[PDB]
Ligand binder design. Structure first.
Ligand SMILES: [Mg+2]
Ligand SMILES: [Mg+2]
Ligand SMILES: [Mg+2]
Ligand SMILES: [Mg+2]
Ligand SMILES: [Mg+2]
Ligand SMILES: [Mg+2]
Ligand SMILES: [Mg+2]
Ligand SMILES: [Mg+2]
Ligand SMILES: [Mg+2]
Ligand SMILES: [Mg+2]
Ligand SMILES: [Mg+2]
Ligand SMILES: [Mg+2]
Ligand SMILES: [Mg+2]
Ligand SMILES: [Mg+2]
Ligand SMILES: [Mg+2]
Ligand SMILES: [Mg+2]
Ligand SMILES: [Mg+2]
Ligand SMILES: [Mg+2]
Ligand SMILES: [Mg+2]
Ligand SMILES: [Mg+2]
Ligand SMILES: [Mg+2]
Ligand SMILES: [Mg+2]
Ligand SMILES: [Mg+2]
Ligand SMILES: [Mg+2]
Ligand SMILES: [Mg+2]
Ligand SMILES: [Mg+2]
Ligand SMILES: [Mg+2]
Ligand SMILES: [Mg+2]
Ligand SMILES: [Mg+2]
Ligand SMILES: [Mg+2]
Ligand SMILES: [Mg+2]
Ligand SMILES: [Mg+2]
Ligand SMILES: [Mg+2]
Ligand SMILES: [Mg+2]
Ligand SMILES: [Mg+2]
Ligand SMILES: [Mg+2]
Ligand SMILES: [Mg+2]
Ligand SMILES: [Mg+2]
Ligand SMILES: [Mg+2]
Ligand SMILES: [Mg+2]
Ligand SMILES: [Mg+2]
Ligand SMILES: [Mg+2]
Ligand SMILES: [Mg+2]
Ligand SMILES: [Mg+2]
Ligand SMILES: [Mg+2]
Lengths: 51, 99, 194, 203, 148
RNA sequence: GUUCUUUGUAAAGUGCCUUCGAAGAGUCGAGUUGUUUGGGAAUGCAGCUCUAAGUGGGUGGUAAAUUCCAUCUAAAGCUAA
RNA sequence: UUGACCUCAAAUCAGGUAGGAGUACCCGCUGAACUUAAGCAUAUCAAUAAGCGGAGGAAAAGAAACCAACCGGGAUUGCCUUAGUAACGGCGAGUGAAGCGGCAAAAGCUCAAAUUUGAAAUCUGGUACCUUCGGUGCCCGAGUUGUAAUUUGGAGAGGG
């Protein structure tokens, strides 16, 4: 919920709702960074997942 | 195309065995593509109308496609692009009324 | 001032012309230079021949399409149709032009022919340093002249048919000149219902 | 590629969304020093498009310029000459504001090399440019075969000579009839066609 | 060469050869074509009628030799056939083996009808012919073949 | 011309088959002012106002509406003689 | 309470870089008047002098948003032409190029936009070592708000 420039990401809720993808606007620009071993990350999204 | 071998007149030219060469990709430069079609449609949903566009449609559903077309021609500058806006805005008006 | 009965000259020298005067004293000098650099390019370019193989091409305008002329590069279709790749032909002595098309089979054929005749007449030394040596022939254009086509015989039979050549041109022209009017008068008729 | 959505959003500068961003950003940019180091491209797709890569040795600066005509910087309007040249107030600079913007950050970071630049915002008083500079001493660039061209001595201050993008525009350089003067270079084509050529055996 | 020049024979007479009253001065009457409409009017109609004012249509970006139609009169024509090969057809007039003459090849673009050709058939091919050129080629058993 | 080497199971070229084929925006363009040009109802540039499109767009040396045609593929870049 | 991130600083932090000179030729900006028009203001001088900024051994230009209207041509540059011509101009004085043709030299191209996604494969630095314009290993940092490969419209991509 804190990307700057915000235009990098504004179109994602719309991109999703159109693609029938569940999205979530989460609090944590750099928390999604900790997620994938970086300082920050704009996105993070699992597609596979074990059964 | 079909020259006549004569130096003058309504298809003057020296006769030659024709040979229609393969098309260039360049000659298809402003060519659609379903990606951009998807992107542009999506971007427009998110963004909306511009104030003059908003002005344009109010002028279509009033006065006429003529009155509004001149306004557009004056704003975009070029009579051709005007009509092009109007047709585009008309399709938006379709996708409103008879949703 | 103005006087006597003389032509009205227009000699533009009102501009510090003297500051920009170029006299070519080095005409001799730069000819020698021009040579002492062709020989010295021929030297390092081994047995290669200093110029690329250049196409045949018709040459434009109503003024010049009678003559035929050495073009720039060989078009993609002529290179493929001669049985080799664009990227490779360049590595030899062949000029290739990606722009420039083929709409004249009589030129196109003459060019693929031009290509093949060249291939037979060179030798393409393999990557390593053992060689038939071979003398270095410097030209290529002199080796592969571009001569003008045939068009017709030195003599033949006379064939009239009352049709005046003059009258044809006259009529060819009249046709063109009124074409649009004619259409409009019929396009007018093409709106006469009931 | 999110970039393709950036580009097309950016075309919509009178959308409610973009107008909002425009109003907030231009205020922000006005409060910072006329030239300041940008932490990152405001338009990552645009910088991208103009040669910028996210590696080390790519620098983005932001710069304000004052917008308008060039008032003839003359004493009290006084021209002292023929009435043609007696103008002061409607004269326009032959370079783009952008050309000014480039040249000024290019002067500040004179160790860098101006690659390119792009508009980002403007008010009535100002226009704002982001300028893509490139370190030529940084070995990341020197070793990058695609970019070591700009390391050359022959590119020192390309913005100052009109070799950047904005330059070759203002400088009027394209093929065709429309650019007969200016394309071989204005003053150069002139000097050519204004030279008397004299051979040894006169022609 | 200077030693051959009047200004060597003038050395020692005041005033060169330019008078005592009237001097030789810097531009009396003005530099160049000054006052063609005024103090030099007489010379400028007489010696140059027509000079001033316009006439006719402008033409933007006129390209010389869109109009390239060089002319050849029957007057010659037989010159476009090699000297030697010429008498061959000349003595053996025939609708059977008449010399084809490509005039476009020779650099021309229109056959004009000035002169007389001998009564010996010719295949003349050209863009454009005068009505009489044709009428004289046909007269002596030839034809005109319009080319391009 | 030697001579170490270290490259290889990795890089490249060509035939047909099919589905595709992303192509640069306050730009192009328009108005206007100023300047410049041989460029003339406006040759390039530049200021402010308007501001695009995707069978699009630019050019096509007389303005405009309409119908065609031809030629390239802008708004990012390098390069010896 | 501890650890990030973003932004913004500081240090004689670690290694670098800019300035000034020259300036014949070169890339831009800025910019006259004398003078010509037998006066003069548009025009001319001149897109010249003077002023300013920036390069190199050449600079710039350059692989077409070109020329053309042909039977078409095919990056740039320059010379011979075009041509004192088309056109501009108190249509006055005066100005004034372009296409084709011959020649010199020739040479071509790469990014942006694409999911590597079964593995950021990319890079600066530090440190050790060595056969040191650099190599490898290791550590930190850069980087997913995108570093490589791949493709650049002549195409080309993905599957058979
Ligand atoms: Mg003078
Ligand atoms: Mg000299
Ligand atoms: Mg050569
Ligand atoms: Mg003054
Ligand atoms: Mg004046
Ligand atoms: Mg003026
Ligand atoms: Mg640039
Ligand atoms: Mg000019
Ligand atoms: Mg001169
Ligand atoms: Mg005497
Ligand atoms: Mg005496
Ligand atoms: Mg005496
Ligand atoms: Mg005396
Ligand atoms: Mg007297
Ligand atoms: Mg005539
Ligand atoms: Mg005669
Ligand atoms: Mg393969
Ligand atoms: Mg490949
Ligand atoms: Mg483009
Ligand atoms: Mg000026
Ligand atoms: Mg103008
Ligand atoms: Mg333009
Ligand atoms: Mg063509
Ligand atoms: Mg360049
Ligand atoms: Mg400090
Ligand atoms: Mg230190
Ligand atoms: Mg300096
Ligand atoms: Mg100056
Ligand atoms: Mg003087
Ligand atoms: Mg005077
Ligand atoms: Mg006087
Ligand atoms: Mg006076
Ligand atoms: Mg002037
Ligand atoms: Mg000076
Ligand atoms: Mg130096
Ligand atoms: Mg040199
Ligand atoms: Mg260079
Ligand atoms: Mg290209
Ligand atoms: Mg060319
Ligand atoms: Mg003028
Ligand atoms: Mg007068
Ligand atoms: Mg005149
Ligand atoms: Mg002038
Ligand atoms: Mg090369
Ligand atoms: Mg395939």
């Amino acid at each position: 919920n804190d990307v700057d420039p915000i235009e990098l990401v504004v179109f994602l809720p719309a991109l999703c709702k159109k693609m029938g993808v569940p999205y979530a606007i989460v609090k944590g620009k750099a928390r999604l960074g900790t997620l994938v071993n970086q300082k920050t990350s704009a996105v993070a999204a699992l597609t596979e997942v074990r059964a | 195309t079909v020259k006549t071998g004569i130096a003058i007149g309504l298809n003057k030219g020296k006769k030659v065995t024709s040979m229609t060469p393969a098309p260039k990709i360049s000659y298809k430069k402003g060519a659609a593509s379903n990606r951009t079609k998807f992107v542009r449609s999506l971007v427009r949903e998110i963004a909306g109308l511009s104030p003059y566009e908003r002005r344009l449609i109010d002028l279509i559903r009033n006065s006429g496609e003529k009155r509004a077309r001149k306004v557009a021609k004056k704003r975009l500058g070029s009579f051709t692009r005007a009509k092009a806006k109007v047709e585009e805005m008309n399709n938006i008006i379709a996708a409103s009324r008879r949703h | 001032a103005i006087s006597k009965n003389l032509p009205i000259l227009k000699n533009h020298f009102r501009k510090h012309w003297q500051e920009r005067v170029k006299v070519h004293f080095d005409q001799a000098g730069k000819k020698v230079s021009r040579r002492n650099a062709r020989a010295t390019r021929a030297a390092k370019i081994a047995p290669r021949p200093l110029d690329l193989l250049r196409p045949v091409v018709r040459a434009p305008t109503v003024k010049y399409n009678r003559k035929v002329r050495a073009g720039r590069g060989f078009t993609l279709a002529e290179v493929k149709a001669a049985g080799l790749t664009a990227a490779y032909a360049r590595t030899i002595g062949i000029a290739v032009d990606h722009r420039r098309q083929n709409r004249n089979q009589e030129i196109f054929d003459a060019n693929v022919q031009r290509l093949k005749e060249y291939q037979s007449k060179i030798i393409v030394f393999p990557r390593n340093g053992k060689a038939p040596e071979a003398e270095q022939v410097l030209s290529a254009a002199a080796t592969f002249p571009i001569a003008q086509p045939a068009t017709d015989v030195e003599a033949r039979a006379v064939q009239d048919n009352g049709e005046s050549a003059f009258r044809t041109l006259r009529l060819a022209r009249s046709e063109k000149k009124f074409r649009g009017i004619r259409e409009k008068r019929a396009r007018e008729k093409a709106e006469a219902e009931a | 590629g999110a970039y393709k959505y950036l580009e097309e959003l950016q075309r919509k500068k009178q959308s409610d969304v973009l107008r909002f961003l425009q109003r907030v950003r231009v205020w922000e940019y006005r409060q910072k020093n006329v030239i300041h180091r940008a932490a990152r491209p405001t338009r990552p797709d645009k910088a991208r498009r103009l040669g910028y890569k996210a590696k080390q040795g790519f620098v983005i600066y932001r710069v304000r310029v004052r917008r308008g005509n060039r008032k003839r910087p003359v004493p009290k309007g006084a021209t002292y000459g023929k009435p043609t040249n007696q103008g002061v107030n409607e004269l326009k600079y032959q370079r783009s504001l952008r050309a000014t913007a480039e040249e000024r950050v290019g002067r500040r970071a004179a160790n860098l090399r101006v690659l390119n630049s792009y508009w980002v915002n403007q008010d009535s008083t100002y226009k704002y440019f982001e300028v893509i500079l490139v370190d030529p001493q940084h070995k990341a660039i020197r070793r990058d075969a695609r970019y070591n061209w700009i390391c050359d001595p022959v590119h020192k201050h390309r913005e100052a000579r009109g070799l950047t993008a904005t330059g070759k525009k203002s400088r009027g350089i394209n093929k065709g009839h429309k650019f007969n003067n200016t394309k071989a270079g204005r003053r150069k084509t002139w000097k050519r066609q204004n030279t008397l050529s004299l051979w040894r055996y006169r022609k | 060469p200077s030693r051959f020049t009047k200004t060597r024979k003038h050395r020692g007479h005041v005033s060169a050869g330019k008078g005592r009253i009237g001097k030789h001065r810097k531009h009396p009457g003005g530099r160049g074509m000054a006052g063609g409409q005024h103090h030099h009017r007489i010379n400028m109609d007489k010696y140059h009628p027509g000079y001033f004012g316009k006439v006719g249509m402008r033409y933007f970006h006129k390209q010389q030799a869109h109009f390239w139609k060089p002319v050849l009169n029957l007057d010659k024509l037989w010159t476009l056939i090699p000297e030697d090969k010429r008498d061959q057809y000349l003595k053996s007039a025939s609708k059977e083996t008449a010399p084809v003459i490509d005039t476009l090849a020779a650099g021309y673009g229109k056959i004009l009808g000035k002169g007389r050709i001998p009564n010996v058939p010719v295949i003349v091919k050209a863009r454009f012919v005068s009505k009489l050129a044709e009428e004289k080629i046909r007269a002596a058993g030839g034809v005109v073949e319009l080319i391009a």
